[PDB]
Design a protein around this nucleic acid. Structure first.
Lengths: 64, 126, 73, 313, 191, 65
RNA sequence: AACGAGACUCUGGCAUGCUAACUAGUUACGCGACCCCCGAGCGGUCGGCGUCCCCCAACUUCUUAGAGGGACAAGUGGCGU
């Protein structure tokens, strides 16, 4: 069934989840086409304007 | 945050402002001098902390009346504002439009008046 | 004072501050500003002294933030 | 017949430019006092991007430099400061000649006599002091002299005898006699706090103003009170023109110039901003100095910038 | 020194982070060229600030690891200066460019987190921030060089050059490259 | 202010049964007039002087002398 | 309104500002000398790092310890009742 790689740019930093408090919510402007905009969960330290490299490019999480 | 002014400070600010408004100013540097004249404050850090919060207030007051502070000048300003009244709004324009029954309200009240009928339909609860 | 790296940073700061102090009394202001510009830009503190200094160790660890060791039971 | 346009702007201070002084000896020079604790001497090109460029910084004061003045020659500078002292500097160079110590508080205002043989100072100590160029304090016009703070003290241009004029919070303007060292006349009438005061060119008038916005005109000679002009906003500094009958006042909203005879409002100078929205604002002009040739007008503003206007027909 | 502010002797200009997004926590010097990988450096107070720190120095710091080696920056600076020289001999170029490349190539794009998952705790594929990508890369390479160097005759400067070069063009010879692929492979399953 | 304001004393009173500890603490109020004390007010203090005198919109006018 | 927290006190950094210092130093002489030639000069002589001379030299910059001021998140811009 599938493969591609997706560039996405941080629009707005949502807040923090993980019970440990170590995953940061993010909103992403879809880079190759701005007419897209989705919520992704992060491992590292993230700040507005820097870029994610999305594997899955649907999905769109929430808690956990 | 970590700097949340405590009552002993915040009180003094409300205090001075109430009895000092036309004396006080926009600027930290001067009120600080003023607190020496108009108050007896024991340490310099406190007096500074006071001057500073009361200035933050003066900065705010001078942009919109603030929730619990009153001074003679602000009272005078509200007083004058609280006069307004136009051509005046009712009129209501020739002829009141009634809902009838309210028409029957006057009709059986022995009272002449201007008129208009548009009062029908029932009429659900909720 | 200080030690080997400590010293290097101090001397370099003294020299640049020096040159600027000199243009301020003898040459003209625009030159000295030009110099503060180049330093301050690329910098390294050249004209401003870094604050950072020892924090005192507190009983219960041999460092300042380091706390000894515990085993419980 | 004629109005004033914004020729250019001088940089370089960081604090607010509290005081300005011109020179006739070298009309090309400008001394300026600032919060930054430094005084800056500038050579004016007219040139082409900053109206001029800074020649010198006068260190040394630890605290807000409140007021400054220059000699006619442009040789020496007198600065007043919160630091509680007064400094005589060499314009040319730097090097404080002397330190004037003795005031208990911030020295608000400084002025020097035409002779260059008196120095007077006003301070938050509510006292006015007379000092020699040496640094010796001859007089302290003491005396309940101000119930209050002393915003400014100016030396009247001459003759019959030395007269000094002070302005204080106490809501009064005071005339003093130097020869005797006793209070000459109490001018009463202000009803807020007096920020600044200025004597006219020839020493027959007095203009004083502060927070209400009422610039006040007094006849010093007759010892009678002339009239009042409503500025509205708070006025920080006043200045008569050397050649014209124009008084200029730095208000909170801007610089208002007006003309005594005939009486009209010549101009309101507001410098602009472009496309800005714009919100907040005013670093209102805290200081102003007239040029030697009444042609130019320098103003010290809160943005730490000196803004210059030149009169054109 | 006055013409252009080179590195020990290497030019900052003309080195380009060949990788969008990463651009910018890799700090060369979109103006910042200096001279030496040592600074007073206050990076710690803020969360971000570290990004400001020159990547070279960042790499040098990671070098001084293991209890004994802590605080030996002079030693690291010395090692770094040597490594750049070895790298240069090996491919011309800017070794600094070589360094940057290895860093760009090593940060795990995707990773995994240990999501609680009930019992048999499963792991959730998540994408990884660029700060983490940089941070992680520099570790990987340093741990790689340090691990290799330890029982072998070869010096850290050399092992570092080898780790950096192989990574610059991802040879997969490198410990770090193999590690990154491992972390990423894991990220993909789980999902 | 503890140093300034309060005097304390501990006394051991031996009694047939055992010993009792008497602790006395006196707080001396020269914050009021103490006096004239090492601070007077308890750093936790702040007296306002408001005006204290003043009046008159009163038009202009001027007095000779 | 008070108590604890805090404010409070102590210590330590920013002060070519303050008042000062031979039981603290520095500049800079007067400095010669020791005096080496280190380079230049054939050498007298010039520039040169220190020690020592100590002086009816000057200073407070480093040092010192006292008093002074600085921070109030002060200005500005987003966000939030």
């Amino acid at each position: 069934r599938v493969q591609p790689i997706k560039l996405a740019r941080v629009t707005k930093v949502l807040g923090r989840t993980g019970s440990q408090g170590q995953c940061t919510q993010v909103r992403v402007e879809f880079m190759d086409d701005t007419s897209r905009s989705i919520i992704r969960n992060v491992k590292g330290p993230v700040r507005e304007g820097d870029v994610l490299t999305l594997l899955e490019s649907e999905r769109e999480a929430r808690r956990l | 945050m970590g700097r949340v002014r405590t009552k002993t400070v915040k009180k003094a600010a409300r205090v001075i402002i109430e009895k000092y408004y036309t004396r006080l100013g926009n600027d930290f540097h001067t009120n600080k001098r003023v607190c020496e004249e108009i108050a007896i404050i024991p340490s310099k850090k406190l007096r500074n902390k006071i001057a500073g919060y009361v200035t933050h207030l003066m900065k705010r007051i001078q942009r919109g009346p603030v929730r619990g502070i009153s001074i003679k000048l602000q009272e005078e300003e509200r007083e004058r504002r609280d006069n307004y009244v136009p051509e005046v709004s009712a009129l209501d324009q020739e002829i009141i439009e009634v809902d009838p029954d309210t028409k029957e309200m006057l009709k059986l009240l022995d009272f002449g008046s201007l008129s208009n009928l548009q009062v029908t339909q029932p009429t659900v609860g909720m | 004072g200080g030690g080997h790296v400590a010293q290097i940073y101090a001397i370099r700061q003294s020299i640049s501050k020096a040159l600027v102090a000199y243009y301020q009394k003898y040459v003209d202001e625009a030159s000295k500003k030009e110099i503060k510009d180049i330093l301050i830009q690329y910098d390294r503190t050249l004209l401003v002294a870094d604050p950072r200094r020892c924090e005192s160790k507190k009983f219960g660890g041999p460092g300042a933030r380091a706390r000894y060791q515990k085993s419980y039971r | 017949t004629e109005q004033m346009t914004l020729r250019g702007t001088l940089k370089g201070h960081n604090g607010w430019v509290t005081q300005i002084a011109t020179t006739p000896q070298f009309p090309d020079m400008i001394l300026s006092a600032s919060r930054d604790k430094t005084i800056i001497m500038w050579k004016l090109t007219r040139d082409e991007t900053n109206y001029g460029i800074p020649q010198r910084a006068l260190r040394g004061h630890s605290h807000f430099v409140s007021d400054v003045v220059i000699s006619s020659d442009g040789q020496f500078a007198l600065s007043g400061s919160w630091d509680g002292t007064l400094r005589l500097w060499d314009l040319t160079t730097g090097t404080t000649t002397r330190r004037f110590v003795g005031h208990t508080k911030d020295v608000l205002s400084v002025a020097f006599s035409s002779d260059n043989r008196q120095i007077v100072s006003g301070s938050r100590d509510k006292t006015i002091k007379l000092w020699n160029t040496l640094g010796v304090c001859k007089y302290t016009v003491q005396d309940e002299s101000h119930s209050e703070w002393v915003s400014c003290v100016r030396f009247s241009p001459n003759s019959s005898n030395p007269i000094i004029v002070s302005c204080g919070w106490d809501k009064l303007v005071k005339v003093w006699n130097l020869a005797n060292c006793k209070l000459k006349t109490n001018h009463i009438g202000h009803t807020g706090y007096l920020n600044t005061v200025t004597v006219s060119p020839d020493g027959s008038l007095c203009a004083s103003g502060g927070k209400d916005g009422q610039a006040m005109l007094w006849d010093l000679n007759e010892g009678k009170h002339l009239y009042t002009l409503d500025g509205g906003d708070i006025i920080n500094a006043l200045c008569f023109s050397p050649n014209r009958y124009w008084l200029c006042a730095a208000t909170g909203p801007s610089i208002k110039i007006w003309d005594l005879e005939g009486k009209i409002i010549v101009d309101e100078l507001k410098q602009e901003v472009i496309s800005t929205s714009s919100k907040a604002e005013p670093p209102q002009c805290t200081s102003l100095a007239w040029s030697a040739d009444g042609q130019t007008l320098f103003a010290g503003y809160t943005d730490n910038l000196v803004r210059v206007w030149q009169v054109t027909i | 020194t006055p013409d252009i502010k080179l590195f020990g002797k290497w030019s900052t200009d003309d080195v380009q982070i060949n990788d969008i997004s990463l651009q910018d926590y890799i700090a060369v010097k979109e103006k910042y060229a200096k001279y030496l990988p040592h600074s007073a450096g206050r990076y710690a107070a803020k969360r971000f600030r570290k990004a400001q720190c020159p990547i070279v120095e960042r790499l040098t710091n990671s070098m001084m690891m293991h209890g004994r080696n802590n605080g030996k920056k002079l030693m690291t600076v010395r090692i770094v200066k040597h490594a750049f020289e070895i790298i240069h001999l090996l491919t011309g170029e800017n070794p600094l460019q070589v360094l940057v490349n290895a860093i760009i190539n090593s940060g795990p794009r995707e990773d995994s987190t240990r999501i609680g998952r009930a019992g048999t705790v499963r792991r959730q594929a998540v994408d990884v921030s660029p700060l983490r990508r940089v941070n992680q890369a520099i570790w990987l390479l340093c741990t790689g060089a340090r691990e290799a160097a330890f029982r072998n005759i070869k010096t850290i400067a050399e092992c570092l050059a080898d780790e950096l070069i192989n990574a610059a063009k991802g040879s997969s010879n490198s410990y770090a490259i193999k590690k990154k692929d491992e972390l990423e492979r894991v990220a993909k399953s789980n999902r | 202010p503890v140093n300034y304001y309060v005097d304390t004393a501990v006394r051991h009173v031996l009694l047939r049964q055992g010993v009792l500890g008497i602790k006395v603490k006196i707080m001396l109020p020269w914050d009021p007039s103490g006096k004239i004390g090492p601070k007077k007010p308890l750093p936790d203090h702040v007296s306002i002087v408001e005006p204290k005198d003043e009046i008159l919109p009163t038009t202009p006018i001027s007095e000779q002398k």
